[PDB]
Structure formats: C-alpha cells, structure tokens
C-alpha cells in the first residue's frame, strides 16, 4: 500500500492528511494551530508536531509506504498549473507569484522548505488551486481592461477551488455513469470560500473567483462581486487606505459583514428568532448564488447536471432549495424529500423528471491531490 | 405643450425641445466644446443661450414655442432624490451634497440648472435622476455584502443607472405586447455608450447591472464592468498606481477600447471581418459578459415573458443581438434570423413566433420620457 502526505501550510496553521490514493482511505488527518503566536513557534516545530500526531495514532512514516509529499499552493499564476515535482530552481521561481497571493503563497513555500529538509528521501510535488482554470477560454479569462497593462502584470481571471471543481465534476460523471467528456455541468463549492464553475467535459468555461479569491459569490467574510469604485469611494469619502479597503472586503464583509455571524449554521436560528440582519445576509447570499447558476446555464446552453459540494453545499438543505427554487422553467426541479433526507456520498436531489439533474457530491481535495502526485511521479 | 430637455455636461450640452402629447421632437441639437480656446461658448451660460438661438433658427422662438418646463438630467440622486423633482434653491442645496457619488457628472448638471433657472425664470425646472427607477430595488439586490455599519454611514448600495431608459422600455414592451405592465416579468438590455441590463417584475425592478456607480456590470465602450475589486490593491502594489489612476483606467481606458483600441461596434464589425484578433477578442469578452447577465436575470425572475434590446447598439446591431441570445433554446429563447435582420426601426419582435420568451427591439426615448415626467409632476 502506498500513501501520500498532503500538506496545507498557512501563516498560523498547518493541515495534513496521510492518504491512500488507491482505495481513498485517510490513515490520519490533523491540524496544527497557533503557529508563531504558542508552543508552536515556527513551521519547523509545526511539521515535527504533525509527525508526533501521526506517530500517536499509530503511523510510522518510515513504515507507511510514503511515496510523496503533496504541497498545496493557492496561486500558480500563469506559469504553474500542472502538478509540479519540486526542486531548488522551481521553488525559487515560485517566490515570484507572491504578489498574486501575499498572505497564502509565502507560508506554503515555508512548508516546502521545512518538509524537503525533514523528508529529503521522497519526492515533493506542488498542486495549484488555480491550475484547473489555466485554460479557461480567452472570452472568460480576459478582463475588459487596458490590454497592455493586463499583459504586463499578468492580470486575468485565474479562478480557485480548482482541485474541488475538477474532482466533483469527475465524481458527478461517475454517479451518472456517463463519460465526463460528453457532460456539461455546474459545480457549486459552498464552504468557507464559495465559488461556482461551468464545465464542458474536461474543460471549465467560466468560474466565479477571479484574479484573487475575492470575486464572485458572497462568502463567510468575503464580499464577492462589488463595483470596484468602492475602493476610490471609500478612499475619497471615508479617508480609508487602499489596503484597509481590501482587508475590509476580504475579512469584514460577506455574511459576517452583514450580520456579525461567523458560523453559517447559526444563521437559521437567528432568522427564526426575527434577526433582520441575519435574514438580510442570507438573502444577499442566496440572490448572488441564484445569479451565478442562471449565468452559467446561459454560458453552457445545455446543462446536464448541477452539483452542490463542500461544508455548506453538502449539508444545508435550505441553501440548496433557495438556490434553485422557482427555476422549473429553466429546467430545474428539486425533490424536497430527497433534498431533506441527508446521507453521506453522492446523491440525487432533483425530481426524477427534472430536465437538469441536481446532485450533492462530496468533495475530497486531499484524495484528488494524492492521486495527482502519484500520476505525475509515474503512476 | 413643449418641454426643453437638457443634459448639461462639462464639455457639451445636449438639448431637445419635445412635444410630449404628440410624442414628437420639435427641435434637437447640441452645443459642443464648452470652455475651449477657439469656442464662442466659454461656459454654461453661453452654451444655453446658443441653444436658444438654434431653436429660434428652426422656427421655435421660446417666446411662442409653448415651453412649459425645462427637464434637467441628473445622473445620481443617491437615496435622497428618486422621483422627478421640482427644483428650487433648497432642493439645489441638498443636491450639492450628493456630488461625491458622481463627481464628474452631477456638478455640470447643477451648473445647467443654475443657468436655466436664471435665463428661464417663468417656467418650472424639473430634475429627473438616472438612479431613480432603481431606488426601491429589493434589499437582496440593493445591498452589497460588506461591513454593514460602514455601508450605512457612507450610503453604499447598488444604485443602478439608465433608470429612465429601463423604465420607459419596460412600459413600451408591455404596450407592444397589449399586456398590462403589472402582469409582466422582463429583461431590458440597454446597449449604448454605457451598457446595462435590468430584471423587472411589473413596475418594480428586481436587479440591475450597474452599481454604486456606472462602472459595474456589462462590458462597455470604455468601462470594464465587472472585475475583482482586488484589481485596485494589486495595481497600486505592483505597478505603483494611485487609486484614482486605477479608477480612471477602469472608466476611460477599459472595455472595448481597452481591449481593441476601437470606439464603435460599427468599426468593430469590419475589423473582425478583416481578421483582426484584438477586435474579435474584445467582442467575444463583451458577448460572454452579456450572455451571463441574461442568464442571471432569467434566474432572478424565474418566469420571464419578454427580453428587449435598446439604445444605440441594441436598436441597430443584429449581430450583437444574435450573439447575445443564440444557443438559449433550452432556456426558452428562440431567435428568428429574418426578423432580427429586418430593416425597420420601430418596436418589433425578433424572436420566432413560437418562442416561449418573446424577444423585442424597443427603441428608447429618454427625452420623451423625461418630457412626460415633467408634465406629470407639474399636474398636466
């Protein structure tokens, strides 16, 4: 049995999972929190802690059939989109993408540096959350701005949750027992970040996040779509600095900005109790999601299936109901008994006669990344 | 009997002398190059007096023309002004405080107001606000998902624009269909120098593509439309640009011109047919964005009765319309090639007879709409 250690190294936390890519078992998963704040002063201590956690649950990486370490990198820009076997020269070049993701890319590079030191005798592979969307059609990838400026600074719609969108698209095809290449679908990844994609066969045609993960759907703390004039308006009238505005949009916006609620699951009870702010937050969220579904129906022209995924998409029946209600004339008919029934694994929530199928399809990014690592290393 | 409708900008003043009851323009024209070195029109006072002479020249002496009002176009009414408003000095004072919402367009409109009230004191002057139609957008559409206390303090919301055109076309679409407006759900696509879409349920708009300002939404002649707001921080950080330079780039050096260097669509067509790659890309980006708004608004409405194209491009460019709604048969839209290519310029059906959703071209007439708003608010 072979395993891949999949790592997500953040500024204050490091998430890991030791995954069997063949039969999909996680031997062990974990998170190291409060890095550099703490008993975990740096990422070196953090990875060592992860080793101790693995050991404590019975795993010896020396005996676990470890064949690769998979490193999650948020932003690969235009240059890194396939799973990439790491060496010193590639890692140097990865440093150049940091202006596209100044919060998230640097600590990933810290995780690579530490892991390559402590685990020098196995391959390390980077997987980029932008990668799936590298070959978006030019019509969807290109913003309508000054072309010379765009080219010089590599400005385009990059898109994120790429691993999840691709994985779920493949799993929806498997659920329907139809070749993926013949299917047109929409995937709704509704989690801490929220993004939508429109996918034809193996090729995405559009996706809701953009240059950065801020664009598109309303999210836990991110605004999604807003007039970019918000920045100059707030700078002029409120006297705010550009970085302050950007921080507000990324961290004090979305559901928390509108309602103060940090846990999406609390919204329902607050609404039921008559909290107007919670109702407004949920309505704004739902309205934006409805628009992206409609928009992507138009992009695709024909849509075979719509799938909900991630922490909210997989679990919140009200979200799913309110996202597609009143769209029977667009070919979407939900079966509320199925929508309400719960369950693990992929399942149909549309009525049997719905022209467009609607599914819940659980995502498993770590499994997908483990498989990517095995594939790029020889299979 | 007649209303002088004006649009007073920094460099030009557009006017039209309108007969609202016969739906006719008695006279139309423009004063250009306001304030220029060689120009005999140094300011807005001079500009308006020129317009008077022109009107005299085409048989209309303002003394015998039956002028009963002047309609003044104001881009932004904020949350304060959203119905046609009879102007006085108190109203004008309140209006000045809104200029941070439209710093380039509102001030020259207020200059036109001052001059016109002074030169034509015996007629009423009425302001019509391009944001007004959308004042009562539902909260889910009006509210951006940002810090609520901050949004309330600085009156940040989706305002929407081209309100006069969206409303008027929605009314004319209902008239074309011999159906009451209240019972209709529709999409209006205003494609001109600026481009915006709306979703309307009866007399109430449910959503519209422009936002806090006219930048948001569709790709336009020189405006980007939708883009990740991180573009500002990113360009300020990497390229060293100031915020105001980025905003200027997004408003003046973006859209079709940003992507192709072209100002038209007429020009775009021939560049495309001769094999120009930048022209094709620009048009593909425009078309993709417009298709998404159509789909988005179909979902907002749930049921849609009619989609209407309007303004300079929507009224005249059969390719734009074909590219915007082809391949949407499964969403209920079936375009008819022959009808779409028809040479006529009145309100007309371009969908196939059996299309579940009707598709129209409905010419806009913002000046007529405003002339009628003036008469109405004055009791006429």
Q: Measured between CA atoms, how close is A268 to chain B, in angstroms?
A: 17
Instruction: Kindly state whether residues B205 and B247 are assigned to the same domain.
Output: yes
Q: Distance (Å, rounded) from C-alpha B182 to C-alpha B171?
A: 10
Instruction: Kindly state whether residues A89 and A103 are assigned to the same domain.
Output: yes
Instruction: Kindly state whether residues B12 and B47 are assigned to the same domain.
Output: yes
Instruction: Kindly state whether residues B167 and B187 are assigned to the same domain.
Output: no
Residues A69 and A7 sit within 8 Å (Cβ to Cβ):
yes
Catalytic residue of the set B130, B207, B276, B373? B130
Q: Which of B178, B202, B228 is the last residue of a domain?
A: B178
Q: In this complex, is the C-beta atom of B285 within 8 Å of any C-beta atom belonging to chain A?
A: yes
Mark whether B130 is an active-site residue: yes
Q: Are strands B195-201 and B185-191 parallel, antiparallel or unpaired?
A: antiparallel
Instruction: Kindly state whether residues A152 and A274 are assigned to the same domain.
Output: no
Core vs surface per residue B14-44: b (16+ CB within 10 A) or e:
bbbbbbbeeeebbbebebeebeeeeeebeeb
Total domains in chain A come to 2
Q: Are strands A66-73 and B13-19 parallel, antiparallel or unpaired?
A: unpaired
Q: In three state form, how does the secondary structure of chain B look?
A: CEEEEEEECCCCEEEEEEECCCCEEEEEEEECCCCCCCCCCCCHHHHHHHHHHHHHHCCCCCCCCCEEEEEEEECCCCCCCCCCEECCHHHHHHHHCCHHHCCCCHHHHHHHHHHHHHHCCCCEEEEEECCHHHCCCCHHHHCCCCCHHHHHHCCCCCCCCCHHHHHHHHHHHHHHCCCCHHHCEEEEEEECCCEEEEEEECCEEEEECCCCCCCCCCCCCCCCCCCCCHHHHHHHHHCCCCHHHHHHHHHHCCHHHHHHCCCCCHHHHHHHHCCCHHHHHHHHHHHHHHHHHHHHHHHHHCCCCEEEEEHHHHHHCHHHHHHHHCCCHHHCECECHHHHCCCCCCCEECECCCCCEEEEECCCCHHHHHHHHHHHHCCC
Residues A81 and A136 sit within 8 Å (Cβ to Cβ):
no
Q: In this complex, is the C-beta atom of A25 within 8 Å of any C-beta atom belonging to chain B?
A: no
Q: Distance (Å, rounded) from C-alpha B325 to C-alpha B334?
A: 8
Instruction: Kindly state whether residues A11 and A122 are assigned to the same domain.
Output: yes
Instruction: Kindly state whether residues A167 and A285 are assigned to the same domain.
Output: no
Instruction: Kindly state whether residues A183 and A64 are assigned to the same domain.
Output: no
Instruction: Kindly state whether residues A164 and A182 are assigned to the same domain.
Output: no
Q: Distance (Å, rounded) from C-alpha B295 to C-alpha B237?
A: 35
List the B195-201 sheet strands across, edge first. Answer: B204-208, B195-201, B185-191, B306-310, B358-361, B348-349
Q: Which of B134, B162, B178 is the last residue of a domain?
A: B178
Instruction: Kindly state whether residues A164 and A311 are assigned to the same domain.
Output: no
Residues A315 and A282 sit within 8 Å (Cβ to Cβ):
no
Instruction: Kindly state whether residues A78 and A191 are assigned to the same domain.
Output: no
Q: Measured between CA atoms, how close is B32 to chain A, in angstroms?
A: 28
Contact residues, B window 246-265, toward A, CB-based 8 Å cutoff? 246-247, 249-250, 253-256, 258-259
Q: Which of B146, B178, B210 is the last residue of a domain?
A: B178
- How many CB atoms neighbour CB A344 within 10 A? 8
Q: Are strands A123-128 and A203-207 parallel, antiparallel or unpaired?
A: unpaired
Q: Which residue, B194, B190, B265, is CA-closest to B223?
A: B194
Q: In this complex, is the C-beta atom of B280 within 8 Å of any C-beta atom belonging to chain A?
A: no
Residues A104 and A74 sit within 8 Å (Cβ to Cβ):
yes
Task: State the binding site of A for Mg(2+).
Answer: 8, 365
Which chain A residues have a beta carbon less than 8 Å from that of B306? Answer: none
Instruction: Kindly state whether residues A136 and A207 are assigned to the same domain.
Output: no
Q: Distance (Å, rounded) from C-alpha A65 to C-alpha A19?
A: 11
Q: Give me the CATH number covering residue A28.
A: 3.30.420.40
User: Across-strand partners of A3?
Assistant: A66
Which chain B residues have a beta carbon less than 8 Å from that of A228? Answer: 215-216, 224, 227-229, 231-232, 247, 250
Full domain range(s) for residue B314: 179-380
């Amino acid at each position: 049995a072979r395993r891949v250690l999949v790592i997500n190294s953040g500024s204050s936390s490091l998430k890991f999972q030791l995954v069997d890519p063949e039969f999909g078992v996680a031997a062990s998963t974990g998170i190291v929190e409060r890095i550099g704040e703490s008993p975990v002063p740096d990422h070196d201590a953090a990875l060592r802690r992860a080793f101790d956690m693995l050991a404590g649950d019975g795993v010896d990486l020396n005996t676990a059939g470890l064949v690769a370490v998979g490193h999650r990198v948020v932003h690969g820009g235009n240059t890194f989109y396939r799973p990439t076997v790491l060496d010193d020269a590639v890692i140097a070049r990865l440093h150049e993408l940091s202006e596209l993701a100044p919060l998230h890319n640097p600590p990933a590079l810290q995780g690579i540096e530490v892991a390559r030191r402590l685990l020098p005798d196995i391959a390390h592979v980077a997987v980029f959350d932008t990668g799936f969307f590298h070959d978006l059609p030019p019509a969807a990838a290109t913003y309508a701005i000054d072309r010379e400026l765009a080219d010089r600074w590599q400005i385009r719609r990059y898109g994120f949750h790429g691993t999840s969108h691709r994985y779920v698209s493949e799993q929806a095809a498997a659920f329907l027992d139809r070749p993926l290449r013949g299917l047109k679908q929409i995937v709704l990844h509704l989690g801490n970040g929220c993004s939508a994609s429109a996918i034809a066969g193996t090729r995405p045609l559009d996706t809701s996040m953009g240059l950065t993960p801020l664009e598109g759907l309303v999210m836990g703390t991110r605004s999604g779509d807003i007039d970019p004039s918000i920045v100059s308006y707030l700078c002029h009238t409120a006297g705010m600095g550009v970085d302050d505005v950007e921080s507000m949009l990324n961290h004090r916006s979305g559901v928390v900005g509108l309602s103060g609620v940090r846990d999406f699951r609390r919204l329902r009870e607050l609404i039921e109790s008559g909290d107007g702010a919670a109702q407004l937050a949920y309505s704004v969220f739902t309205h934006r999601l409805r628009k992206y579904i409609g928009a992507y129906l138009a992009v695709l022209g024909h849509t075979d299936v719509i799938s909900f995924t991630a922490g909210i998409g997989e679990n919140d029946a009200a979200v799913r109901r309110d996202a597609v209600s009143g769209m029977e004339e667009l070919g979407i008919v939900l079966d509320e008994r199925r929508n309400l029934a719960g369950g693990k694994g992929a399942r149909q929530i549309s009525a049997d006669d719905s022209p467009i199928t609607v599914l819940v399809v659980p995502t498993n990014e770590e499994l997908a990344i483990a498989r990517d690592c095995v594939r790029v290393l020889g299979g």
